[PDB]
Structure formats: C-alpha cells, structure tokens
Symmetry: D2
C-alpha cells in the first residue's frame, strides 16, 4: 500500500520545467545528490542541451554521467509546479514509475514535497517507505487513424479557432445520456477535479475515489449540474448529426484536435495509474493543498 | 453480479406508505399475486390492523395468511409501494443485512422507484424466477456518543439548526485531522444515493450509486469558497461542536428523529458493511439517467 | 410610460432573420397588412434581393412600394433573439420602439405571438401598449483609434484564436477593483442577464433594474462570485502589464477584435435605450419568458 | 451623494453592542469627545445601566450629562460602535426617517462599518463640520397581515422553517401575478445591502447598495433551476402559504423575532421610502470593494 520496492531503485528521471532560470541551482543540487549515491540519472534530450547549463562547466563534472532518455526508469523526480507531472505523464503512456514532485514557490496539488531539507526526504523515499496515491488516468481514443492518449487532469471538448455555440452528444455504454450545448464539456479524473473542472462549478474529489467527472462549461440550460459516473464505464462523445461548426478537443492543455462529423472520442479509465508520493498521507496532504492553493474554507 | 438466488425466495415483505388511499387497490393486487404463487408474505404489525383494509371483504381470507413481521433472515425479498419514502423506511427497519428490494412508483416517479406498476405480473415473475440487475447502494453507519446508538442512513445525515435558533458552528475531523470548521445553516454527509436527495438542493454534484464515496456538502456557508467535496468510502468522519460556540446543534438521519448534539457529543460516520440492493428495470446507468431526466429535469432543453 | 406617439407613425422597418424559408410567408402577410393601411414600409437592401423574394411575382405588386433603408419611427422584428440584436446594431443612436414576433421559439425579447397579428399591430399603432426601456452599454475601444460600439446583451472579453487565460484587469472609477483570470469576463445589461451571462451562473436581472453585470467564465478562484454595479459607473478593462497571450473582445456574440497591451475597453450605460413593446406588462412577460425559455423553477 | 447638514448637528445617538467588555474604553473616549464640543449626547435607556458604566465613577462626570433617548426628530446623527449588528439595531430603533449613521469596527471590518477607530478625532470632526460621502442604503417595508405589524428591514427577510420541519411550500405573488411556488428550506427577500448578508450564502450575486432592486433567493431549492433573481424597486411582493400545504412557515426579519405564518396570513414587501444613510470612508465603490475583499475574500488569489 505504501511503497513496494521489489529491487532497490537505481534509475532516476528528472524532469525540469524548462525555460526558467530559477530552477538551475535546485536542479544542480538534486543531480549532485543523485549522482553522489551511485544511482543512475536520466535527463531529457532538451534538458541536457540547455545553453544555461551548457555554459556552466562546474556542473559539467556530472553532466558526462547523465544518461539520456521500457522499464529502464524506476523513479521520477519533478521540479516545478502542476505542469511537470503532466509532462511526465505525457512521456509515459504505459506504466509510470513512482513520482515525487517538489514545489519551487507554488504549492499546487501535485507537488506536495518542499525543497527544504530535500536530503532526508530523498534518502527516505529511496531507502524507506513513503505513502503513495494511485491517481487515476483516462485512456482517450480518437477515431477519425485511431490515436491513444493518456489524460491526467481533464479532457475538454469546446470551441476553438472558430467560436459558435457547440452542441455535442455524449453516449454512455451506447445509451445517449445527454446532448450538451454551451461552451463545451469537461471529462476529468479526480486528480483534475481541482483543475479547470473546478473553475466550472464542479465538486472537488479526492484522488482515491474511482470516478469520472462530466462537467459543463457555461451550459445553456440552468439545470445541467456536473455529474460523476463509475470508473469502469465507457464514454463516447461525438458531434450531434444536426450541428455545423465542428468542435475542438484538448488533452490537459495540449495539442487541440478538431473533431468533425464522423469523429468519435472514447474515454475510459486507464489501467495504468500514476503513483504520486505524498508527504504524510493522502487525506491531510489533499486538504492542505485545498486550503493553501484555492483557499477552500479560509474564514 | 445480477442476482445470485439461493433457496429461491419463499418469504416476501411488503411495506406500504400508509395513510394513503390510492395504494389500497395495488396492495390488494400485489397480495393476491403473492398468495397465488405459494409465496409467504409478511406484513408489519401496524399495517394489518390499519382500517379500510381491516374492514375489507373479499380480502380477509388473504389477511389470515399474512404472518406478521417483527423486529433474523425471515425476509428474503422486499417490495415497496410508494415513492422515495418507503425505501427509506425499509432501510430503517433493517439495520443489518437487507434483502433485495424493488419499489413501485404509484404515480410519482422518483429515484428509488424504478419499476412501474403497470404489468407488474411479468416483472414479479421475472425477478423471482429469472435474474434482474441490482445496485448495491451504499449506506452510512453513524454512531452518536453523548451512550451509543449506531443508526444506519441511506440518503443523508444533516447537522444543522432546529429547535435552536441561529449560527450553527461545528468542526469536522477526518481520520483525526481537523479538515474544516463549518458555519452557516449546517453540513450534509450523504451517500451517492443521497447525491440526488437534499444534498442536491445545496448545490452538490449528482453521483451514481456505483461510485464509492462520501459527500460533504454545506448548507448556505458564510464563506464563498466552501465548495462541496467527496471523500473515499473507507474514511471515518467525526463531527462535533467546536469548543468555542454556544447554540448547540441538531442532527437528523434521513429526515427522521432529530437529536440535539452539544459539547462532549460526537457523531462518527463511516461506510456501512451492509449495502442496500435495489433492483433496477434495465441497468444502473440508463435507469439512473432516465430518473434524472424525468424527476429533476437534469438537462431538459 | 406606455407609449407617447407625438404623431401617428408613418414608417415601419421590418427586419428579417434571412437565410430561413419559414419566415417568407409571415413576412409577406405582415408587409401586405402594413402597406394596406397607407403606411410606408422600409426594408434593407440586402433583404429585398433574395431569390425567394425575386421569384415570387405575386408579391411584386408590393415589392415596388418598398422604400429601401432618423426616418424610421417603428420597428418590427421577425425572428428569435437575434433579430433584435441586429436591429440594435443598425441603430447606434435613438432607436424607435421595437415589437418582435417569435416564429417558433419564444425566447426573451420576442413576446408577441404571430397568431392574429392584425389586432396586435393595430392596437400598437393606434392605442397604447406597454414598453420596457432596456438598457444598452456604450463600449469604446481605444487602441495603441476609437470604435464606440453599442451593446444590448453582453460584451465578452475572453480567449478566442488565442490559447491561454489572458489575465486581465478591471478598473472601476479608476480604482483597480480586481484582476480576473480563467476563460474571461462578461459585462452585460439586465437584458443580457438571461443571455450568455446566465450560463455562467449569474443571477437573472429584470430589465427595469438599472445595473451593469460583471460575471466570470470559469474563474480559477472559487470565490469570484458575479456582481452588479450601478448603471452610471464607468468600467475600464485592459490587460495587466504582466501577461502575454492577448485577449479577444466580442460584442453581442458578433465580430471579435484582439486586445493587446495599451488597449482599453471603456464600458458605460448608454443614453440611448431600446424601447421593447411588451404584450401584457414587463413583469408577466419576463416571468413567462423565464418559465418557457430557460425552464425556470416551474417543475 | 454628499452630506449637506443644513443646520449644525447638535445631537448624537451612540449605540453599543453591549455585553462586550472590549467596547467600554472606546465608548468612554467617544463620549468624552462628543461632550467636549458642546454637542448633546443621547444614550439608550438600557445602555446607561451597565455595572461596568455604573462602577466607573471617573466617567460619572459626563454620565450625568447623558440625555436619554425614548421611542422623533431629536436625534440628528448616529454613531455605532460594533460590527454589522449595531447598524441593524439602529435601523430597528428608527422606523421612520433615519439620521446619518457612522459605524466603527472594533476588530472585524465587516460591510456596514467602514470607519476605523484609529485616529477618530479627525474623522468625527470632518463628519460633523465638513462634508463626507453618504450612501442611501435601501430598506424594505414589510407588512404582516394575520393585525398589521409594519416592520422595516435592512438586510433581509427570511421565510423558512423553524421550530417546525420539512418543506413548507409557499407561494410568491408579484404585482398580483403568481410568479413562483418555492419549495425547499425557504426564500430570502433581501435589499442590495443584504446581498453580502445571508443571501450571499445561498448562492446569490453581490449587489452594490446604489442599485435599486429587491433580491429573491432560494435556500436549498428542490428544483435545480430556481436561481436567484432581482426585481425592480417599486414592486410589491406578497408571500403566503399555498392552500395545499400543512407545516406552516416562519418569518424572520434581519435575524429577529420569528413569527408564524399560517393559512390566511400574508407578508407584503415593498421598497421603503425611508432609506438609511451610511457614511463611507472614501466613496461607495472603493469602500464596497475593499469590504468585499477584506471580509468575504471575494477575489483573493
């Protein structure tokens, strides 16, 4: 339940926010720590070729020891806020190793660890047992040339370069449950319940609750209230065969694909969840994040 | 998954809304069918002596065959005649394991009454002989420590004002950590079944009964940011008065007896180990969405 | 209060939705009934050029008498909730009283029913009917050139051909009341309260209440509840001098323009309201439209 | 928009929250200031009887000069020391024309108490001699027909449950036309001032006090569509129980005496002709937005 290391971890993949000068010293210190304890370090192609770190030769003594990015990765460290873990999930479409994320200034949700005294935290997580949460992920299959994507926070079917009132049908196990008008629909995981789905008047869901959230974006009906459906159900969103001005689908703020007549978007609960490492335990960590980030019940 | 019958049912409990004349003839017809197919039927000790049915010819012979249920395992199949209130009473009757229940809406279509009364002959024969689909709706076990009561709740538990006047203020602990202190009218801790109950009126999200969760929803919170949340099924909530406020609170169970909670009293809420099996007409998903469309007008446009 | 005809009206401007065949026959009937009572009828040039109106020689007898389009004294709208917006767009100054018919969709701005329209038209022209002076917003866009558009339903400052939040500041009397993030902001009239602003969770506002509505579209803050401000105050919206991804502004759900740094959008309550003719009285019409169009509390 | 005093103000009424020891020294200092500049001071009967004010003989030198107010053109200016409750009590005292009111907050910024106690010398002198900015907050005239009562309210009037329970369905007529039949916990009819009051907790939009309107807001409505609305100032609402429902309702006036309303009772609400002038620190817009930011955390991010 907490942490099952079959064999002692030896590979670390460190993902950096990139295009940010504030992270150079933290990345350098963390890499020195990881290389000190005889543990292999992996770095993305674009991160090792960063000109700012290329110019610095003092760190170069460990640059030559950086392997370049399966199952070869065994432990992921994220340096950033709420975007580094999304990129990490994008990188691994299959089984993803345990990930711990450090917040360098903004506490967020997916970055519970504080950078201060990271020595002991890293040593404890590698050697000892920490607590993990198996955040659910959505498998999304787009039929136009079928492509599979993995979504952590939400998938948004909305307007785009063109902007008229969209009208899209949602089928659930083959039964047409609703047609949604307005600015669009959000299908989200419990992890993304505090993401954009929260801004659309949707309830916040702990990541341990297996569910799929359907939330509107400014629905034209005063009664369309956000709902949740069981994790194992298969959603299928497609254009109603009555409306022009085809829609656009986005996957956690990533490549927006235009969906037209005859296109289908199938959403299911993926079998490959994301283990996120928590500082103390899921409940207190989640509630502290709620209190500190969106000011849930400050009064 | 659908219906695993053992020792195919011989005992059937029929619960009526009571104090409603419109249910008399459906009750007669259901009793006649249940007597017809060699089926033992239990009726409560408060519905038998009920007038009208007491002084009703052509049915006394049926009455003599009604063995009286008392407060087990002498019940194997429950039939509810009414809307959205008969099943709550049925849940109140069985604090432990509850047999499968189907409820008929006699005019008022609801959320716990999938089956329609018309052509109930085939539906009853199919459910007894064949296999239908069931949903294991979750229930909350609530312990009130002043003495412990250990009530069971199906729709929601509401901690609010009452005979007191103003400004309820209560702390909520979750696994011993003080997650929040809620002010305003009160708090609602509800099951997914109660997502469409009173908790829905408070701005909460509708939850399918197959999603294991516990809903915490405010009732007019003084803070503009206190948004309804859900927590995992297995976590233990503990609600109690903050040790700063007078005007002690009142707690209601599924819209039933309201107990006054004061300083030193605690309300422990957990997910019960005895869910309620409710029989659906076709399947949980389509039945739930059709109920949402017909009853609350979820997305009519 | 009801209708002050200084002189009996001699001019009608009939505005048609266009690109809809269902309106042809009612348009013919209305035009014949207006022409038969010795009263001049105005139609836009783009309206009297359709192939449908050209082919029908039977109507040609009155097509010649159509005077193409300060000179208008009475406006009739045939359509739903879009014809009145177009009419308001055409009249940037003092707009004559407008009475609108709903051919199928009751809407909010089209209370009149087309059945037995002879009596209604005669009662409006000769007798006294009730009017509502719907408020309008004067919106002046200052670039790094002034536009001075007039808005009836709402003005929306949001994303568009752009991609991201476009955090934007709102000043009120020159004081920075707030910075809004998320999808965007809506500044609406009470008439537009039942418009797109209603989809964002804003309260429904009676047209007789002088106010300006500020409503978010999916705000990242859980507390940014929609507000209203006095009619006579001057709003000034402009991008914060910290954010890229310049925003887009749209008036009445129509042509959108990109606003960047150095741009300003000044919103005030216009001095030229829109008189809309109601069938019974403002209260009953507003509540009937609420119950029939947006499926209000009736249950 | 500005306070034209005409004649020089000579009388002040000081209203204290009472049953609070922290206000004693501010009350003493304010009273010495008010008596110093040859300006008559009025104190309520029940305020000048406290043990704290009786024991302090040092203040007695000015206690003898305290004129006593009785339940009315004697009062020309009101000073309230407290938070969000002193102004409501002042409004309750004056059912007719209300003299200008300045409110000080001793710790909680609130909404109706913009003035800060620190350096009150200059503020009081500027208010008395010079001209400040005022806002004419709207009040609602509410008449209860059983015997008429003729109450005046500032924040809201709430028609809901109480020592009773359950829905208590109630009809709202508006200019003689039945607009809606509200169910749920009840309805709130509020002034723009009450937009930040209890009505805010029910999901209603905040309204600046310069917008003439009357707010109708549900309290947990059983219908998902009954979203709060506003109506013009000159309207006449008339709320009464539907002739179909038992479980009569209860009416509360800004959190005050709750009266039963049963079949045959009526509650008529209109915009009063006697608004409350509240003195602002800088101007209505900035003061209102600063209060929204500080008190309810409107858009803190």
């Amino acid at each position: 339940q907490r942490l099952t290391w079959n064999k002692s971890p030896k590979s670390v993949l460190v993902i950096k926010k990139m295009r940010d000068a504030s992270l150079l010293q933290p990345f350098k210190e963390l890499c020195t720590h990881l290389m000190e304890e005889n543990m292999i370090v992996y770095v993305e192609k674009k991160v090792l070729e960063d000109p700012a770190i290329a110019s610095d030769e003092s760190f170069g003594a460990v640059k030559k020891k950086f392997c370049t990015f399966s199952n070869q990765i065994d432990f992921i460290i994220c340096l950033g806020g709420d975007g580094t873990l999304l990129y990490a999930s994008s990188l691994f479409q299959g089984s993803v190793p345990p990930v711990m994320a450090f917040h360098l200034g903004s506490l967020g949700f997916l970055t519970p660890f504080s950078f201060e005294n990271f020595q002991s935290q890293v040593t404890q997580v590698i050697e000892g047992n920490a607590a993990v949460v198996l955040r659910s992920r959505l498998k999304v299959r787009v039929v136009k040339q079928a492509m599979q994507y993995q979504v952590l926070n939400e998938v948004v079917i909305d307007r785009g370069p063109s902007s008229y009132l969209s009208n899209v049908d949602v089928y659930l196990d083959g039964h047409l449950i609703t047609t949604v008008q307005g600015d669009g629909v959000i299908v989200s995981t419990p992890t993304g319940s505090t993401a954009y789905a929260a801004a659309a008047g949707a309830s916040m869901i702990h990541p341990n609750v297996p569910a799929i959230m359907i939330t509107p974006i400014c629905p034209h009906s005063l009664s369309f209230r956000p709902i949740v459906v069981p994790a194992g159900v298969e959603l299928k969103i497609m254009l109603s065969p009555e409306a022009r001005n085809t829609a656009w689908v986005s996957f956690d703020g990533r490549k927006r694909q235009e969906i037209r007549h005859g296109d289908s978007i199938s959403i299911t609960t993926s079998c490959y969840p994301l283990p996120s490492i928590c500082v103390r335990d899921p409940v207190s960590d989640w509630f502290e994040s709620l209190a500190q980030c969106l000011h849930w019940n400050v009064r």
